[PDB]
Structure formats: C-alpha cells, structure tokens
Amino acid sequence: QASPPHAVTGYRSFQLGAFELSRDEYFARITWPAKGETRSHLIPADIFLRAMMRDVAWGFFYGWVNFDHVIGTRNYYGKVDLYAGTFNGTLKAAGVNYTENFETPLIMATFKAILRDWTNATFDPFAAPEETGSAFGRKNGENLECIERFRIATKRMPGLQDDSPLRNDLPVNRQFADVSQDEPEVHAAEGFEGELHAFSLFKYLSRSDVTWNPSVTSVCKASLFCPTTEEFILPVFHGNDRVEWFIQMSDEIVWDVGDKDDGNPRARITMRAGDVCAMPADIRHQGYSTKRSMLMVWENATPNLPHLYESGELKPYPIEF
Amino acid sequence: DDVQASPPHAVTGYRSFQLGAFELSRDEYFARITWPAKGETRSHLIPADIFLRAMMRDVAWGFFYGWVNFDHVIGTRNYYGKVDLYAGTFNGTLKAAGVNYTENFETPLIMATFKAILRDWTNATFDPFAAPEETGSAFGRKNGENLECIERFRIATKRMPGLQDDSPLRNDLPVNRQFADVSQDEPEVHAAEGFEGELHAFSLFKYLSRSDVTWNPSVTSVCKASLFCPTTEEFILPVFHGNDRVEWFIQMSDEIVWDVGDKDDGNPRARITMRAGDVCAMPADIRHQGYSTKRSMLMVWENATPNLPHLYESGELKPYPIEF
Amino acid sequence: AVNTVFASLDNFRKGTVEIISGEARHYAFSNIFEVAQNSKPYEKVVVGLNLGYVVETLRAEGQSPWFTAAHDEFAIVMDGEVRVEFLKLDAPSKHGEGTHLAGELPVGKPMGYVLLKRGHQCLLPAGSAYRFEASRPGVILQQTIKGPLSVEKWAEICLK
Amino acid sequence: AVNTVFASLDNFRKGTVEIISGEARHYAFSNIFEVAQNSKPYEKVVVGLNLGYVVETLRAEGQSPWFTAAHDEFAIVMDGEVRVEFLKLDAPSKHGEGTHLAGELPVGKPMGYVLLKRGHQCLLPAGSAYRFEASRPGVILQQTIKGPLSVEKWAEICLK
C-alpha cells in the first residue's frame, strides 16, 4: 500500500495494517488509531532509517527490536508484531498504544520499500555518520549499492567451494587501514590440493562495508560465528531471548544493558580487545563504539531455544558459579 | 579564569575539563562525562552533535531557572546564580542504585567552563545554534573554531528593537533559506512634523525571518515584566527543559509538536500540536520538548518578575494559569 | 520552493491538545483567528493571562475608540491592514495600569500615524492616546496589563 | 592516522562490568589473553558455554597432541603464530562430539599444513587429526563442542 510521491517532499507514504508511515525533510512519522482518535509519533529520518535497516537485514530474527521508546517490532518467527507505545509504561497505562501482528514477508517487503524510497543517494543506513552524508531534505535519488548488496549465506566457512565469498573485491575501510591484508599460508600435501581451508578473518572484517550487522563466518552445527564491524551507535536497542556470547577482537565497545521491560539499567559493560561476555536473555542491549571495532558474536542456531527460556529448564544467564 | 582545561590531547586534539568532581571530554563521536560514586568511577556518553547543541542553549539562556536536560542522565538544575550539575540524579533507576552524583557551581564558573568547552569542541564545520540542514558535522578530530558562532554579540532589548538606545534590527543578517517567502517590507511610519523619531514600528516577521539562530528566544517587546520573546524553531529542541514559571506559547507560523511530560518521572501528559494562530499555556509543573519540520515563528511570552518561581511552591500560585 | 504558513481570518487550522494525563483545561488552548473572528470589533479579548499581564486579541474592523495607558503597550497586526493614529496628550496618564479610553475627543498634539500590515509590530508609547483604523477585517495582538476594557471568556475560546 | 588495537599475551587490558542491578556472575566476564597466560599449553579452557557448544581458549606454546573430532571445528589465532598439521585418518570417527586425542600416532596420510598468524582462521575438518605448532607463545580460539579435553574453571577466569 504505497501512495504516490507526495507533491512537496517527494516521498511516498505507506499503509501497513492500521499503521500509516510518512516522512518529511526531518522526521519519519508513524500514525495509528486508539481510544477513538488518531495517534502520532515522530522520529528523525537518520535514526528511523538506520533502525529499519537493521531490522530488515536481520530478517527480523526473533526478539524485541526497539526503534525508540515508543516504536519497535516483536519478531515472532513467521509473524512480526509492530507496536506503537505498547512496551511503554505510561502509554498503555493511558491506553493510547497500538499493536498489530503481520506475516514477516509483508512487513519485510514494505520496510524494504520504505527503505528504497526514503533513503537518498547521499545517505547509507548501513553506514556510520562519518561514512555517509545526510538523511535530510526532500527526495533525491536512491542509493543504489545499499539496494544492490547481495547477501550470500555461509554454509560451512567463507572462501569455500559452494559457499559465500571472501572480500578481496572490497576496499579496506578507512578505520581498519592499519589491519594487515596478508592471507594465511596453506601448504597442501601432494594429492591433497584444495583439501585445506583458511583465510584472514581480520582482513575479511577490515573490508566490511557495513556496521552492526553480524555475518556468519564459521558453522559448527548450530554453533555460529557471526562477526561484524561496529561503529558509532547500535541503531536500535534490541535483545533476542537467547543467550549470546560477545567476544571483542579489537578496540572497545561500551554496552548499555537493561531489563527488557521497563528499562532498568542493570549493567554498563565495557569490553576491550580480548574480553568475553555472555549477554543473558532477560535483558536488551545497545552499544557504543568510537573507533570501528571488530566484534565476534557467538550465536546458537538451534531452533527450539527461544521457546526454551520460557520453560523452566533454562535460565536467562548461561552459567552458575 | 577559574576554568580548568587540560592541554589539547594528542590524538583527537580536544581539551578535557574539570568542573568540581566532574571531568568532561570528547572524542570523534561522543562527549563523555565522568564522575565518582560508591568509590568507583561512573561514565556517560553523548553524541557530540546532540551534546553541544544542548550546551549551547544553556549558555545562551543564562542558565535561567528551572530544569534543563541534556538526556535522561545528564543535565543542569539552574538556581539563580548557582547551578546544580547532575549525573543520573533525576533518573529513577540510577538514583536508587546510588550511582548518581550532583554538584553545586557558581554560575559564572560553569558558564565560563561551558563556553570554553563550546569554543574548543565546536569545530569550524559545526554551528550549535543551527538546525541540522544548516550546518555541517560535529564529528571527528578538532579542526578549527566556528568564528561565526563565537562572534555573535548579545545585546539586550530595553524597550523594543530599532529604538535609538536599544538592540538593533536585523537588516544586516541574510534571510534564512526557509523564510525566503516572507515579505521584507517594513511598516510605514509617518511621524507628524516635530515628532520626527518618536513613532516606532518594525516588521517582526522580517526580524524573525533573518534570525540566524534556532530555539533561542530574543526579546522584542517590554511591558514592565511582560516580555515578548520570539524565536525561530527548526528540527528538535536540543534539550528538554521546563521552567518553574508559566510561559505562554503563541504559534506565529507553520507548526510545532510539543512533547509534554511531568517534571519528575517523564509520564507524558500531553502531545500538543500548534498551527499558526494557536495559543497555549505551558504550566509550571511540566518539562517540554518541541519538534518542527519547517523553521517556524514562535512567540514565547515570559513574565520576568523576580519572585514567581518560588511563588509556585508557595501555596498562593498553582502550576496552571486559568481555572475555567 | 518554501512556503511559510501564516493563518488569516478566512484561512486557519486550529491545532490540537492530545491528553495522555491531566486536563486539557490547564493548557487554556485557543486560536486567535477564531477568537478575533467572533468577537465585536476592537473587543479586547484576553487570550493570555499571566499574573496581571495580558495578551489581547482584538478584531480590527472599522474605527476604534481612543485608547490610552499609563505605560507602554505594543501591537502586532496579525492579519490585514491597520492604521494607528497617535496623539500626544496635554495631560497624560501618570498612574494606573491597563488600557483606558482617552475619551470622545482628547486633548493633544497629533504625532502622526503608523501603517501596519501583517506581521508588523508597533510601539504604543506611555502617556499617549492611540486609535486603530481598518478598511478590511484584521487581527491585532496587544501586549498590555489587564485593563477595565479586557474581556475574559475562556469557556468560549478554549479547549475544555 | 588510524590505530586498530589488538591485544596480545604480553599486552592486554581487561574491560569492566559496572553493575547497576543483578550480579556480575551472570555475564561470565573473562579476557582470553589473561586466561591464555595462566593455563598450561594447549589446555582447552572453556571461556564460553552454549548448551553444550563451546568456545575454548588454548595457549599455543610448543607442540600439541593429535586432536580429532567427528565434526568440523575451527581455529582462530588471536596472537602469534601456529602451524596446523593435518592427517587424513584412514578410519575417521563417525560418531561422537567434542575434541578427542588422535593417539600418539594416528593412522593417516599427511594432508599438509596451514600457517596461521593473528586473525587467521582455519577449518579443522571432520574426520581428520590435527596438531598445533607454535614457536613462541600464542593464543588460539577453537569453536567446537564440549569434549573430554574441555576444562571449566569459571570461578578462576570470571569476574565474580
């Protein structure tokens, strides 16, 4: 449900159930019904677009993704709740909030459509501020290679035969320009050509042209190594309901961690190179990163986990000691 | 002079500053504020661009009176000529944790300091008084100073702008891009002969069209304590403060959404939209923050009488102006 | 292209007060072009009351009485054209507050007149008499103190 | 100028958990280079435990036993340099999980070797035996399942 381009601004507006989604030179606007009358909320284009980009790029995963303290999605599996104010203490207390459930490909397609439309040539929602231009003003082009970015899923490990590429066709990021580009030496014995596999992971991450977007690099059954390059701020504040393990590989990241309900800060965690950290399941997080830093995320891709912290079996935090 | 600044740091080029038990420093993306509690060091990060905007306001408003909030942790509680600077104190969770910290400062001191911090951390490429579309980035290593923001003189309105011993008009400032459709025609004033020069009229909308700053009320009329303090609004109010007196907003063009909430917890109380013409009393027991897509013209109407603000927890006066 | 949206008497959009908690009364919410639209000409309608001081909306249609006050006042024409005549009184008001009437015909030297279009601001000097003249309907904001002539009617001009 | 900060065994800086509420234990906070400094060579220290799956941190010093696993495994050299030697087992372990000693001499033809400097990763194929060669002490991360060789000592590596 996309309107024609509006006359002044040039951005279409969108329908998504009882949600209408709009944008001007400064704000993304979301509109919705409750106790009678029309409700609204504004979000700076640059924030909204970055938050929506992550949501789409993460396939919605499973868990809460918060745009601000009013807007966010619940990422149910094949369904996705989009709430406005629901997980906001005073707003439902007011009864002015609104949730609506959706089939994931619908919301996915729509967000992808909004992202195509509201993101100009000058902006890059995958980028850090110093990397891209502004998200402000009337419609002005599309940014093609945000659009033109194929994702190829790792099945065993990058570099391999029937699986995702390395990135030797990607420029080294400014802020990793001091990271060695040398590749491991492989000396296959005679009659074993191509049987041994190794690559430079730090080289691989040095050429990451996105920020805050874990990509799988090693599959050991369910055990996933999904590293990413982190700069500025996590565009959302999110939290899956599985236990994940963070491992800092370079530079540092400050993590804000709070109770997935009200928001109660529970911890402020600062990871420096080499730090290992469990992010429990009953908390949502958001991180800060001055220098572009290399972060290993360690996920467990078994399918019954996020309906298992629910059951009494499994606690939010991984280890008693 | 009592300002305490480090030398420029090697990498980022920025100084860092002490204000009592507070250190303030900056890197390529964030301003950082550090303080003691429970015998350990506590820290809080804030985007340079969001940070400096908020600081620039508090400095331009003479700190005033009332609560001025940089975010949900950091802000100043200004008290006459004394200003509290607090870190997480007016934050439910943090205060119950015992991790917050407040400190008392002589206004000239904190004012001096904050100005020093602006001069140092605001690069040639950034204007803290601008809307985003107007100015460049706040980000990166130190590079220059914004002379334009530094070199803006403050001249008080005694009676009204344009008068012979009063603040000037603005026919020396360029018309702001977004007010480019606003008539620059001045009133006609035919003084009867013998009265050459004691009839006074100017174009207010011309005067605001040429306003070079954003979210800074500038006085345009003095009727004893009654003060007409218009200003030009764009994007978002860089802080979310509220005074401890009743102010009346009057929307003179376009529109502004105001997020309005209780001065403690933040319980949204209202979401008021004003379009050109609207009149609304901002009561005394609430904080507020405004959004404006298009640069608009807001009249703020202040009562400058000295003793209202503790007349408002004196029992005589109520937070809202009119019972009806 | 930029379009600055000014309202007039034949063209305006009341805003809105969404209440999440409290009372839409406490915001004394009004729009001046609706007030000045159903008030008598030069009825001084109080749209702002701050502890004695006031902002008045006056409907500018035809010729007003001669006003005077013991202190300065200001006018902003918010719509249309208004002409303000000034008389320098022989015996001006030295004591008191609020707009008063200068009487049918005042004792003073003409000081001249100012021509105010929309968005034009004017000084009404203490100890002078002034008078408004509109050929077409217009809207006036006066900054003054509550005077004998100030009309309060919040229940008819405010969101409740 | 840009400076990317990698830690090493002779040069690291543990981070911090500032607790506003709850307990630091629940986050299982450790630093590998501290762990790797403080454990016997090729001691497989679990630093991350997810429902059976594990991340081990090994101190790469000297030559290791022959390891083998029924499934794929991965090594990343976090510091220094490791030579990984590979044997194609004649009779690979079909069934089981985790890391396993391939015995003092396994049965297999030599596949060759891989040379991993800091930030190089390498597949340790299912049904091969592999062995590590480090001249000077390094650090190794191994993504695997909890095996008979996995050491847990949370109390001595974690912020409590």
Tab-separated table of C-alpha atoms in Angstrom, chain D residues 22-158:
chain	number	residue	atom	x	y	z
D	22	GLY	CA	21.798	-8.016	39.363
D	23	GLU	CA	25.159	-9.766	39.657
D	24	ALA	CA	28.366	-9.772	37.607
D	25	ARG	CA	28.468	-13.598	37.697
D	26	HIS	CA	25.569	-13.840	35.246
D	27	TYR	CA	27.630	-12.222	32.477
D	28	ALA	CA	30.561	-14.643	32.842
D	29	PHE	CA	33.143	-11.954	32.111
D	30	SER	CA	36.656	-13.003	31.084
D	31	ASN	CA	39.600	-11.945	28.915
D	32	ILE	CA	41.205	-14.670	26.759
D	33	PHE	CA	44.762	-13.271	26.865
D	34	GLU	CA	44.588	-13.320	30.642
D	35	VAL	CA	43.290	-16.906	30.513
D	36	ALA	CA	45.844	-17.948	27.885
D	37	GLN	CA	48.607	-16.595	30.107
D	38	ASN	CA	47.517	-18.572	33.069
D	39	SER	CA	46.892	-22.043	31.759
D	40	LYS	CA	49.139	-24.897	30.596
D	41	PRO	CA	49.971	-25.044	26.865
D	42	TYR	CA	47.046	-26.337	24.740
D	43	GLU	CA	44.934	-26.708	27.818
D	44	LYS	CA	41.468	-26.343	26.303
D	45	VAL	CA	39.858	-23.750	28.597
D	46	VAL	CA	36.163	-23.189	28.042
D	47	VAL	CA	35.520	-19.456	28.016
D	48	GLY	CA	32.051	-19.710	26.516
D	49	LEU	CA	29.460	-22.420	27.019
D	50	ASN	CA	26.277	-22.503	24.997
D	51	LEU	CA	24.045	-25.507	25.702
D	52	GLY	CA	26.862	-27.922	25.035
D	53	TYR	CA	28.620	-25.991	22.291
D	54	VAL	CA	31.835	-24.296	23.491
D	55	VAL	CA	34.488	-21.679	22.771
D	56	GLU	CA	37.866	-22.805	24.061
D	57	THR	CA	40.956	-20.686	24.565
D	58	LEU	CA	44.211	-22.558	24.134
D	59	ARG	CA	47.721	-21.403	24.994
D	60	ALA	CA	49.733	-22.098	21.835
D	61	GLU	CA	53.222	-22.994	23.112
D	62	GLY	CA	55.327	-25.809	21.655
D	63	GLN	CA	53.742	-28.868	20.026
D	64	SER	CA	50.315	-30.310	20.822
D	65	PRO	CA	48.882	-33.811	20.844
D	66	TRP	CA	46.978	-35.043	17.827
D	67	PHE	CA	43.378	-33.971	18.154
D	68	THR	CA	40.447	-35.353	16.252
D	69	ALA	CA	36.683	-34.775	16.121
D	70	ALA	CA	33.685	-36.411	14.456
D	71	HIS	CA	32.581	-32.970	13.246
D	72	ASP	CA	34.006	-29.773	11.793
D	73	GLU	CA	35.892	-27.412	14.044
D	74	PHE	CA	37.522	-24.057	13.639
D	75	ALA	CA	40.598	-22.364	14.999
D	76	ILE	CA	41.384	-18.642	15.056
D	77	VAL	CA	44.859	-17.493	16.008
D	78	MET	CA	44.410	-14.479	18.266
D	79	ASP	CA	48.096	-13.861	18.884
D	80	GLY	CA	51.381	-15.019	17.460
D	81	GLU	CA	51.671	-17.975	15.097
D	82	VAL	CA	50.512	-21.516	14.861
D	83	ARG	CA	51.280	-24.223	12.288
D	84	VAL	CA	48.328	-26.602	11.990
D	85	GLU	CA	49.332	-30.046	10.744
D	86	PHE	CA	46.663	-32.263	9.166
D	87	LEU	CA	46.380	-36.076	8.903
D	88	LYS	CA	43.661	-37.724	6.739
D	89	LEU	CA	42.585	-40.564	9.045
D	90	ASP	CA	42.111	-43.987	7.440
D	91	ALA	CA	39.303	-44.696	9.913
D	92	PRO	CA	37.712	-41.333	10.939
D	93	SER	CA	35.432	-41.075	13.998
D	94	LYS	CA	31.945	-41.302	12.538
D	95	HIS	CA	30.051	-40.860	15.795
D	96	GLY	CA	30.553	-38.643	18.860
D	97	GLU	CA	31.080	-34.987	19.751
D	98	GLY	CA	33.834	-32.727	21.082
D	99	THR	CA	37.655	-32.914	20.979
D	100	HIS	CA	39.466	-36.209	21.256
D	101	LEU	CA	43.093	-37.380	21.306
D	102	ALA	CA	44.022	-38.975	17.980
D	103	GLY	CA	46.599	-41.018	19.895
D	104	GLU	CA	50.399	-40.781	19.811
D	105	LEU	CA	50.417	-41.788	16.206
D	106	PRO	CA	47.095	-41.893	14.300
D	107	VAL	CA	46.558	-43.842	11.103
D	108	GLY	CA	46.600	-41.450	8.170
D	109	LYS	CA	48.328	-39.893	5.181
D	110	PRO	CA	49.666	-36.325	5.860
D	111	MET	CA	47.456	-33.692	4.255
D	112	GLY	CA	49.923	-30.861	4.651
D	113	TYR	CA	49.836	-27.829	6.934
D	114	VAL	CA	48.410	-24.321	7.372
D	115	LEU	CA	50.261	-21.228	8.694
D	116	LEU	CA	48.059	-19.022	10.864
D	117	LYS	CA	49.155	-15.590	12.032
D	118	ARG	CA	46.999	-13.311	14.256
D	119	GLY	CA	43.468	-13.025	12.927
D	120	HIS	CA	43.723	-16.016	10.653
D	121	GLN	CA	41.083	-18.731	10.857
D	122	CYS	CA	41.124	-22.265	9.577
D	123	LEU	CA	38.750	-25.189	9.170
D	124	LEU	CA	39.630	-28.262	11.217
D	125	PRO	CA	37.764	-30.871	9.076
D	126	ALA	CA	35.616	-33.651	10.475
D	127	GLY	CA	37.457	-36.947	10.408
D	128	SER	CA	40.946	-35.554	10.291
D	129	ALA	CA	43.501	-35.422	13.034
D	130	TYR	CA	45.152	-32.074	13.610
D	131	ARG	CA	48.033	-30.755	15.662
D	132	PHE	CA	49.388	-27.311	16.594
D	133	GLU	CA	52.964	-25.981	16.237
D	134	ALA	CA	53.909	-22.679	17.881
D	135	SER	CA	57.497	-21.392	18.186
D	136	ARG	CA	56.616	-18.568	20.604
D	137	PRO	CA	53.524	-18.476	22.858
D	138	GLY	CA	50.290	-17.537	21.088
D	139	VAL	CA	46.533	-17.640	21.645
D	140	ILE	CA	44.014	-19.895	19.930
D	141	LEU	CA	40.249	-19.812	19.802
D	142	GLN	CA	38.613	-23.118	18.927
D	143	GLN	CA	34.902	-23.307	18.068
D	144	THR	CA	33.803	-26.804	18.960
D	145	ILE	CA	31.521	-28.873	21.180
D	146	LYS	CA	32.392	-29.582	24.821
D	147	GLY	CA	34.749	-32.546	24.723
D	148	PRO	CA	36.704	-34.776	27.172
D	149	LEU	CA	39.531	-32.258	26.939
D	150	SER	CA	37.460	-29.184	27.744
D	151	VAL	CA	38.376	-27.517	31.041
D	152	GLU	CA	35.859	-25.483	33.021
D	153	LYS	CA	37.147	-23.117	35.677
D	154	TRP	CA	34.684	-20.245	35.599
D	155	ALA	CA	35.430	-19.222	39.192
D	156	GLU	CA	39.077	-18.505	38.301
D	157	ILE	CA	38.663	-16.730	34.956
D	158	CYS	CA	35.433	-14.788	35.514
